[PDB]
Each structure stands twice: as C-alpha cells, then as structure tokens.
C-alpha cells in the first residue's frame, strides 16, 4: 500500500 | 463538452478510460458532487471489487493510502476526482 497527494490549483 | 486530464495515476490503462467514462456518466445524470461520487464509487465496487472510495469536488486536498494499482486522480472539466481501493 503506498500513500498519494493530491490538491486541485 | 468536458475535458479529461488524468493528473495523477497508478491504474491501467483500461481501468483509467473506465474511471473517465464512469464519471462521464455520472456528470450526465447528477450535479451534486456527493451523488457524482456515489454513482462512481459503486459502480467500482460492482466492477472491481470493493472496496473504492470517490471525491469530488472543485476545491480539496488530500492525502490517502491506495492498493498499488488502484488510484486515479483526474479532471473532468474543473471538477477534480480522486478514485481509489483501500
């Protein structure tokens, strides 16, 4: 299991 | 109509076009973003096991833990998608 960012501009 | 960007992603190919062509639908059928997102999440269920989590929205972040080949986080247009098994 690996761990993910994410953030709309 | 909506233009698809796929921004960040560890899924197939074929996976990823579904994701794109399952939130194309849901769009049609829904505006709130919850009932988008639910429409997406069981239909991920039904079709590759559960256990999918969706959101959608125009302004979030995030920071989540996905099986090794099942996240996507894309555009549709200006709202965002993040799709993953956990």
Same mark, same amino acid.
């Given at each position: ?9 | 109509?909506? @233009?698809?960007?796929? @921004? ?5 190919? =074929?996976? /990823? /076009?579904?994701? %794109?062509?399952?939130?194309? /639908? ?8 919850? =009932?988008?997102?639910?429409?997406? @999440?069981?239909?991920? =269920? ?31 247009? /200006? %709202? ?7």
């Amino acid at each position: 299991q690996e761990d993910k960012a994410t953030q709309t501009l | 109509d909506r @233009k698809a960007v796929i @921004k960040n992603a560890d899924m197939s190919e =074929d996976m /990823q /076009q579904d994701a %794109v062509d399952c939130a194309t /639908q849901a769009m049609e059928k829904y505006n709130i973003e919850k =009932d988008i997102a639910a429409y997406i @999440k069981k239909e991920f =269920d039904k079709k590759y096991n559960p256990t999918w989590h969706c959101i959608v929205g125009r302004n979030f972040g995030s920071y989540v833990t996905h099986e090794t080949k099942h996240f996507i986080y894309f555009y549709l247009g /200006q %709202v965002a998608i993040l799709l993953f098994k956990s």
